[PDB]
């Protein structure tokens, strides 16, 4: 009921928002989120919308407390529990309650393009052991940006899924040592060395 905010996913592609997400959004008094998240959810031009610049603890704490006086909704791109706010949330002394509303992630869109099951991979957010180890039992699905060190991947065949569902969507294939990254919205698929 009260003394709590919602963190809702905006989805990845247009028309991926859920009936529950819209209801939560429709009721909110103030909506926080990055411009992409707001745009995606179709509320970047709403008057209740505040575009977030930062996403650190301090900034989420502010939003958090304001949620005691008013109904707050935070929109995250894609799915909230995929390379989302989880981590910093654990660092916040929880007075107000927080509830998560799932949405479709770039991870799901990529898996759908590849015809690969989630139980066949390990989702990585952008280690040493995360290479040989995980690759021993799983393909890797890495959420990367243009600064991902491909080095750290050898001569392995990789599939780059760029800007899924965006104007410049591209799927490329090649070897980590001879392919260049160019988009900050890049999912890197690495088949398990079986």
Binding residues: 79, 106, 144, 164, 184, 186
34 binds, among a second copy, ligand SAH, none (CB under 5 to 8 A by kind): none
- Residue 68 beta carbon to ligand SAH: minimum distance, rounded to whole angstroms: 26
3-state secondary structure the chain: CCCEEEEEECECCCCCCCHHHHHHHHHCCEEEECHHHHHHCCCCCCCCEEECCCCCHHHHHHHHHHHHHCCEEEEECECCCCCCCHHHHHCCCCCCEEEEECCCCHHHHHHHHHCCCHHHEEEEECCCHHHHCHHHHCEEEEEECCCCCCCCCCCCEEEEEECCCCCCCEEEEEECCCCCCCCCCEEEEECCCC
Please report whether residue 77 would count as binding ligand SAH according to CB under 6 A: yes
> In this chain, which stretch among 59-67, 132-140, 159-167, 172-180 interacts with ligand SAH, using CB under 6 A?
159-167
Least Å distance, CB 185 to ligand SAH, is 4
For a second copy, the binding residues (CB under 8 A) are 11, 13-20, 23, 79-84, 86-87, 89-90, 98, 100-105, 107-109, 111-113, 115-120, 122-125, 129-130, 133-134, 136-138, 143
For ligand SAH, the binding residues (CB under 6 A) are 12, 76-79, 82-84, 105-106, 143-145, 161, 163-166, 184-187
């Amino acid at each position: 009921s009260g003394h709590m905010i919602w963190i809702v996913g905006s989805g990845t592609c247009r028309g991926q928002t859920t009936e529950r997400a819209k209801e939560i959004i429709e009721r909110a008094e103030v909506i926080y989120g990055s411009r992409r998240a707001l745009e995606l959810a179709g509320v970047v031009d709403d008057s209740r919308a505040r575009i977030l610049r930062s996403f650190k603890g301090d900034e989420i704490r502010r939003i958090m407390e304001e949620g005691r006086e008013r109904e707050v909704a935070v929109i995250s791109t894609g799915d909230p529990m995929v390379a989302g706010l989880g981590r910093v949330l654990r660092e916040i002394a929880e007075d107000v309650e927080i509830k998560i509303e799932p949405a479709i992630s770039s991870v799901q869109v990529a898996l759908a393009r590849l015809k690969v099951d989630l139980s066949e991979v390990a989702v990585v957010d952008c280690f040493d052991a995360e290479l040989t180890e995980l690759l021993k039992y799983r393909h890797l699905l890495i959420l990367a940006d243009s600064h991902f060190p491909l080095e750290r991947l050898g001569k392995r065949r990789v599939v780059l899924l760029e800007n899924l569902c965006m104007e410049g969507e591209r799927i490329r294939e090649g070897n980590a040592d001879s392919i260049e990254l160019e988009s900050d919205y890049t999912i890197i698929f690495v088949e398990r060395e079986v």
